[PDB]
Symmetry: D2
Amino acid sequence: ALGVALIGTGFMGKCHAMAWRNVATAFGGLPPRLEVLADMPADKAHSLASSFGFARGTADWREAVSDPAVDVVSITTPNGLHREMAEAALAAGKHVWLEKPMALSVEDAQAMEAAARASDRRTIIGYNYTRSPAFRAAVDLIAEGAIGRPIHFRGMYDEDYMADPDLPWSWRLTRKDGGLGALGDLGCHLVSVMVSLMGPVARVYAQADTVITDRPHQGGTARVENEDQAQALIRFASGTSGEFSCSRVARGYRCRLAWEVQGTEGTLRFDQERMNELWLYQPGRPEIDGFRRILTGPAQPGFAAFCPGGGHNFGFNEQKVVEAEMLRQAIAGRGKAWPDFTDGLTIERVIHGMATSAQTGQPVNF
Amino acid sequence: ALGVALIGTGFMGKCHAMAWRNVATAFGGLPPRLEVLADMPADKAHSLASSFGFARGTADWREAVSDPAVDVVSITTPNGLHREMAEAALAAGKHVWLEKPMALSVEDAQAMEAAARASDRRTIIGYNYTRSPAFRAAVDLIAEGAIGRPIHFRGMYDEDYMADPDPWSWRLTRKDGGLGALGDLGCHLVSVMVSLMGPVARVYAQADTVITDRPHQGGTARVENEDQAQALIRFASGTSGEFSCSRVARGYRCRLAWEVQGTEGTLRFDQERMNELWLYQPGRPEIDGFRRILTGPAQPGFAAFCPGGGHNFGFNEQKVVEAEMLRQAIAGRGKAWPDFTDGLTIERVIHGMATSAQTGQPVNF
Amino acid sequence: ALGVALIGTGFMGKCHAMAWRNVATAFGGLPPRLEVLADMPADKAHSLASSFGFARGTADWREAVSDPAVDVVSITTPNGLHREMAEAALAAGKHVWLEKPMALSVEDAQAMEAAARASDRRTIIGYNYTRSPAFRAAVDLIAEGAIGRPIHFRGMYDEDYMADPDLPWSWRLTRKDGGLGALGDLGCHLVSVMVSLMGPVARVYAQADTVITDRPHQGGTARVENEDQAQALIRFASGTSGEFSCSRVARGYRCRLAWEVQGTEGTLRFDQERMNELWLYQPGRPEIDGFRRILTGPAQPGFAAFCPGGGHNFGFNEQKVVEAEMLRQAIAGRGKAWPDFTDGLTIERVIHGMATSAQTGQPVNF
Amino acid sequence: ALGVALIGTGFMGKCHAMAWRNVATAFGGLPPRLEVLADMPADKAHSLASSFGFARGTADWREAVSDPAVDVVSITTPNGLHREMAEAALAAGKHVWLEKPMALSVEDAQAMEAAARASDRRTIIGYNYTRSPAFRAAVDLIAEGAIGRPIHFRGMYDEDYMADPDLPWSWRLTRKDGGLGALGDLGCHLVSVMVSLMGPVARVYAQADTVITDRPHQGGTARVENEDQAQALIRFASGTSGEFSCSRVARGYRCRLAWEVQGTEGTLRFDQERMNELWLYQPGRPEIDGFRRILTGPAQPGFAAFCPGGGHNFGFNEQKVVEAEMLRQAIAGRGKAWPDFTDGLTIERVIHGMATSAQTGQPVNF
Ligand SMILES: NC(=O)c1ccc[n+]([C@@H]2O[C@H](COP(=O)([O-])OP(=O)(O)OC[C@H]3O[C@@H](n4cnc5c(N)ncnc54)[C@H](O)[C@@H]3O)[C@@H](O)[C@H]2O)c1
Ligand SMILES: NC(=O)c1ccc[n+]([C@@H]2O[C@H](COP(=O)([O-])OP(=O)(O)OC[C@H]3O[C@@H](n4cnc5c(N)ncnc54)[C@H](O)[C@@H]3O)[C@@H](O)[C@H]2O)c1
Ligand SMILES: NC(=O)c1ccc[n+]([C@@H]2O[C@H](COP(=O)([O-])OP(=O)(O)OC[C@H]3O[C@@H](n4cnc5c(N)ncnc54)[C@H](O)[C@@H]3O)[C@@H](O)[C@H]2O)c1
Ligand SMILES: NC(=O)c1ccc[n+]([C@@H]2O[C@H](COP(=O)([O-])OP(=O)(O)OC[C@H]3O[C@@H](n4cnc5c(N)ncnc54)[C@H](O)[C@@H]3O)[C@@H](O)[C@H]2O)c1
Ligand SMILES: O[C@H]1[C@H](O)[C@@H](O)[C@H](O)[C@@H](O)[C@H]1O
Ligand SMILES: O[C@H]1[C@H](O)[C@@H](O)[C@H](O)[C@@H](O)[C@H]1O
Ligand SMILES: O[C@H]1[C@H](O)[C@@H](O)[C@H](O)[C@@H](O)[C@H]1O
C-alpha cells in the first residue's frame, strides 16, 4: 500500500483525506496507508489525525515529507507555502499531490517545474473540476466527433465570496503571498478545463478590475491589490476563438464554473453548480430537434466506481477521489497523470499572461 | 470506535462501505473499525474486504453478525433476507442499519419492530433521501413557518431501470423483493412525505404492471409485482396529498420530486438536482418569485463536508450523514429516524396502498 | 367578411378582440368585420368599441346578438351568464365562441348543447391551451408513435390568483356566477388537454378543499362557496392510469398547467409557464441518452403563420388567434372546431363528476 | 388616427402589421388607420394588404411614403435599402419606424441621422428586445437600486439559422446587402440592450470568424463575405467591463440573446429563449439566499395592457406592439422614442468599431 502524508486540514486538507480514505473502496487495489498528518498547532494536528485516521500527527511538516513510510505527499496549505513544501517533498523522493495554483508567480512555478523534472517522481495539481464524470464524458464526446470541429469556446467561473465590501482585508489581497486574485483562485480552474476541451492557448487579450479596492484592516482600511474579476478573448493553437472570465465578486454565484463548446456539428454546455448535467445539441429532424440533458450515470468516466445507477448525483468531493486514483495509477506506473508540474506551468503562464495583458491593454502571445 | 459488519457489497453495500469509512473524517470522533464484510461467492468477499479495508471477508453472513468486535451491522441484501438478518443481528446485541424497505410484509415488519424493542439496541432504516442538506433545510423551514400551513403535498418518484429491455433483479419477485415500485421506491417517497406532512390517515391507490416478462431471460421471467402506482392521500392533519412511484417512467433516473404548497409559500425539490431547494414566499410584486436555494454551509450536514456553498453535495454523502445519525443515537446523543417502530408505520402505508389498489377501496390507518 | 359581436371586454374579452383583429393577418382570408361590442355600462362600451376598432358599442347584449350584420358572437362574460347568452345567440342563427367552462352545472351544459345542435350553427369553447404549437406537436408526436403507448398521465394546473386571503371576493368564488371553484375555472382546461392526449376518462376518484373559507367584500367577510383545490386519480377508457389536480391557491404559480405522458417507448413533458418548450425522452445510446428540449418553432403546428424563425416565443394571446382561425374555418366548412358544445359537454361531466366524487368519497364511473 | 404605411411583409413586415392592428386595442386611443402596404410583386401586396387590413397594396415603396394619408412609415426591407427608404420617408415629412440595423456603414447612418435632424419628424429603430416586460422591469429594478452599481456585463446572442453549410448564399451574407454579418444582424440588437444597461462604450477589442466560407450558389459556390460569429471585450465609458458575442452558426440556439449584469449589490440575468423570466439575486439571510425567478406579469411595464394575470407568457410579437405604442406616444409629443436615428448612429459605430478591431487586431476607442 501507498504511504500517504497530508499537509494541512482545511477546505482541501479534509477533501484529500476523504479522498485517500475511499480511493480503494471505489477503484480497488490496496488502501493507502495514512501515515502522517501535518498541521498547526500540534494539538490540532493530533486531534485531526485521530478523526482522519492518520497514524500520527505533527506540527512540523518537514518531518511529514521526510518520513520513511511516506511515498506521496498531499499539499493543501496556502499558496505562499506551495513552492517550499513541494520542493522539499520532491527532494525527499516523494510523489506530490499539490493544490492549485502552483505558486504565487510564474517564476516560482518554473522553479517547482524544474524541481519536478529532476526528481523523476510523479506530480499532480488539484484541478479537480476536470475529474467530474460529465466533464470527462464531454472530452470523450468531442474526440468522438459528437459536435464536429469546435468553433468557439465560452467559459466563466463566477463566485461571490469576496463580494461583501465589509469582508476583512488580508495579505491574500496583496501581490506578495497573495499573487493574483480571481485569476489565481478561479481563473486557473477554468483554464485547466478549457485547454482540455480546446487544446493549447496561442493568444489572449484581457482586462481586469478591482471593484472593492479598500477593506477593513483592524482599524482603518487597506488597499486590495489583486483583481476581483478578469475577462479574456482567446485564440487557441488550432486558431479557434474563445471567451473567458472569472470573478470572486459575482453576487449569487457560489461555484459557477460554466463552459460551452460550439462546434460545426453540435454544442456542449455545462455548469458546475449542476455538475451532474451535460447539455448536448446535435442536428436532428425538425419535429424533435433540440438540446439533450444528459444526466450523469455509469455510462460516463469514473461514475460506475461510485454508483451503478444513473441520476444518483456525483458530488464535488468525489471528484477528488478520481484525482487520487489518477495519481495512484501514475505512481503505480500504469498511467500518466494530468496535470503534472509541467502541464501546470503552462496553465500558470496563461493566467499570468492574461494578467499581463490586462495591465498593458495589449494582447499576449504564447 | 464502532466495530462494523457489512452484509452485501452491491449498490447499497458499497455505499455503506464508503460512508462508514468517512463518517469521522467529516464529523470528528473516532473512525469506525471495518471488521467483517459478507457476500457470495467467498472469493469476491475476500477481494472486496481487501479493497474496502475490511479485516475479513466471508460468504457466511451469520459470521459477520456474530463477530464480537462488531457493534453495528449494515444489512444491504435483498428484501427477502432483511427479516432473518435483522432479527439475528438484534438478538446478537448489535445495533442495526437496515436497508429499506424493512421486509416483504407488514407481518415481517411487526416481528422486527417487536425484536427491536426487546433488543434495546438502536435501529435506523436506510431512507437516505431524508438526509440531504436541502431536505433537512426544508423540514426546518416548514417548522419555522416559512411556508405557513401545509395545505397540499404532491410527490413522485420516477425511475426507468425496468423500462430497459436488457436485467433480472430480485426486485421483481415476491419472495425476494415483495412489493414492486411501492416497496422499492414508494417507501422512500413515504419517508420524505410524512417527515414533511405528519402521518397518513387515508389512501386510495391504483397500480399497474406494464412489463410482464423480462425480455432477455431465456426462460419465463414473470414480473411478480407492480411497475407503478399512484394514490390520493389524507394526512392525520386533514390535508390533501398526491403520491406516485414508478420503475418504468422513461427518461427518469432518480426523480424523487416533491413539493409542499403552504398558505404562506411553496417548497419544491427534485432529487435529480439534489442541491437545489425552491422556495416561494410572497414579496413585493416587482421582485416576486421562487428562490433557488443552492445547498451550502447554512444547511444541516453540509459544513461537515465543505465550507464553500455550491460545491454540490453527493448522493453517497447522504449516507455519510445517515451513518453519523446512527452513531449519535448509539452514543445516546440523538434519536435516529426512522427506527423499526417508525419504519413499521411506513410499511403499513405502502402495503395499505397496495391493498387499496387490489380492492378498489380506500384504506384507513 | 364574417361579422363579429363581442360581449365582454375584460381578461378574455380583450384577448378575443385582439384575436379577431389579427386572425386574417396571421392566416390570410378576409379580416372579420368588427360590428358590435357589448359591455356595461354604456360609456365603457362606446369607449372600448372605439379603441378595439368596433363599428358601435351598446349596453344591451341582446341587440348585439340579433344584429343582422353579425354572424358570430364571442361570449366572454362570467360563467353565470354563459347559458342565457349562448342560447340566445344560437337561436338568432349566430355561431358562438364561448368562454370556458360552459356554465354552472351539467344541466346547463346539456341545455346549451341541445340548443347548439338544434340551431345548426358552429360552436367552439375557449380552451386555448390546446392551441399552442407545443401542445399540438405533442399530440402529433403521440399519434406518430414517438413515445409508444401511454402508460401514465400526470397533470396539474396551479395558479395563486386567490392565494392571498386579503384578496376581494369575486364572481369566480360564487356557485351562482362561477359554479365550481378551481375545477370550473382551471380543471376544465386540464381536462381539455388530458383527453386530447390520453382519450376519454373512464373513472375518477377525487378529493377537494376550501383553504380560504372567507374573503373581504366591500364591507367585509364573505363566505367562499366552492373549492380552492382538487385532485383525482384517473382510469382512462384506454385502461391507462392518470393523476390530475388543480388549484387557485398554489403559492408562486401563475399559469402552471403542467402535464406529462409516460409511454412504453418514451415520455413527453410540458409546463405552460414555459409554453415554448416540449420535453421528449426517447431511448438512445447510453452516452447521449436524455430528454430533448424542443424549442417552439416553424416545425410545430400554427407557428409559421406568426413567425418564420424558431425560438421567437409564441405567446398566450396568440393561442387565441389560432382558436379564432379554427372557428373561421369551421364556419366556412373547411375544418372542425374542437371542442364544440357536444365535446364541451363531456368535459363538464368529468369536472362535475370529480366534484361529486370529492363530496361522496366514492369513485365516479363514466 | 395615425396614418400608417408599411413597406415589406416578411419576418418583420408581418410583425409590424400585427403590431399596428392591435396597438390601440392594447393601449387605448384611436386605432391607427392602415393606409398603404408596399411589397413585391404587386399581386402579393394586394393579397396581403387585403388580409392585413390595409386600405390598399402597392408594389412601389416610394408611393407609400408620399401618400398624403400617411403620417408614419414602417420600413422592414433588407439592410441595403434602409438608407434610401428612410431618407425618402423623412424628405416627405413622415415619421419613421426603421428596422435594424440602420444601414450598411457608419457613413450611411451619419447621413440618415442628419436627415432625421433636418426634418422635424420622429424616428425609432426596431430594437424590439428592449420592449419586453422583462427587460423594462430589469432596467427599472436597476434604476430602483435593485443591484447597486453594475460592475460587469456578459452578453451573447446565439442563433443557428446559418449553421447548415448547404444553405444557399443569400442576402444577410453579402457586404452590399447585409453589410456586417453576425454583428450587423444580431450584434446590433445586443448593443441596443447592452448600452441600455451599462451606458456608452469607450473601447472594444474584438475577434471574428467566417466558419462556413463557401456556399451553394446556382450550380456553383460563392464566397461568404462577412463573419458568422464575433466576440469583444468592452470597456464602458463608466470604466466598467463587459463581454460581448454574437453568432449565426451556434448550433441548437434559435434566439439566445442572453445577458447578465453583475452589480455591487446584486445580479440580473436574462435569456430571450425564455423571454418571460428574469433572474434576480439580492443578498439574503443564508437560510433562504438565492436567485429569484421572476415570471413576467402585470407588475412589469407594458404587460397589463395585454393581460391582467401573470404567467400568461408575453410573445415575441407583442414586443412590437409596445414598440408601436412608444412611437405613437412620441408622435403625440408625450414619451420619447429610443433609439432615434441619433442614438442609433452610436450603436452603428460600436458594431462597425468591433468589426474594425477584429479586422486590424487592434483595440478601437470611441
Ligand atoms: N482544488 C480546489 O478546488 C480548491 C478549493 C479550495 C482551495 N484550494 C486550494 O487549497 C489550498 C488551501 O486552501 P484552503 O481553502 O483549504 O485554505 P485553508 O485556510 O482552509 O486551509 C489551510 C490549511 O493549511 C494549514 N497551514 C497553514 N500554514 C501551515 C504551515 N506552515 N504548516 C502546516 N499547515 C499549515 C492550515 O492550518 C490549514 O490546515 C489553497 O492553495 C487553495 O488554492 C483548492
Ligand atoms: N437506500 C437506497 O437508496 C437503496 C439503494 C439500492 C438498494 N436499496 C435497498 O438496499 C438493499 C440492497 O439493494 P442493492 O441495490 O444493493 O442490491 P444488489 O443486488 O446490488 O446487492 C445485494 C447484495 O446482497 C448480497 N447478497 C445476496 N444474498 C446474500 C446472502 N444470502 N448472504 C450475504 N449476502 C448476500 C448480494 O450478493 C449483493 O452483494 C435492498 O433492500 C434495497 O431495497 C436501498
Ligand atoms: N380560456 C381562457 O384562457 C380564459 C382566461 C380567463 C378567463 N376565462 C373565462 O372568460 C370568462 C370571463 O372571464 P374574465 O376573467 O374575462 O372576467 P372579467 O371579470 O375580466 O370580465 C367580465 C366581463 O363581463 C362583463 N359583463 C358582466 N356582466 C355583463 C352583462 N350583463 N353584459 C355584458 N357584459 C357583462 C364585464 O363588464 C366584463 O367585461 C369566464 O367565463 C372565464 O372562465 C377564460
Ligand atoms: N428586430 C427583429 O427582431 C428583426 C427580425 C428579423 C429581421 N429584422 C430586420 O428586418 C429587416 C428585414 O428582414 P426580414 O427577415 O423581415 O427579411 P425578409 O426577407 O423576411 O422580408 C423582406 C421583405 O422586404 C421586401 N422587399 C425587398 N425589396 C423590396 C423593395 N424594393 N420594395 C418593397 N419591399 C421589398 C420583401 O418582399 C419582404 O417582404 C432587416 O433589416 C433585418 O435586419 C429584424
Ligand atoms: O434506483 C433505486 C433508487 O435509486 C433507490 O435509491 C434505491 O433505494 C432503490 O433500491 C433503487 O432500486
Ligand atoms: O388565470 C386563469 C387561467 O389562466 C385560465 O386561463 C383562465 O381561463 C381563468 O379564468 C383565469 O382565471
Ligand atoms: O433570426 C434573427 C434574429 O432573431 C433577430 O430577431 C432578427 O432581427 C434578425 O434579423 C433575424 O435574422
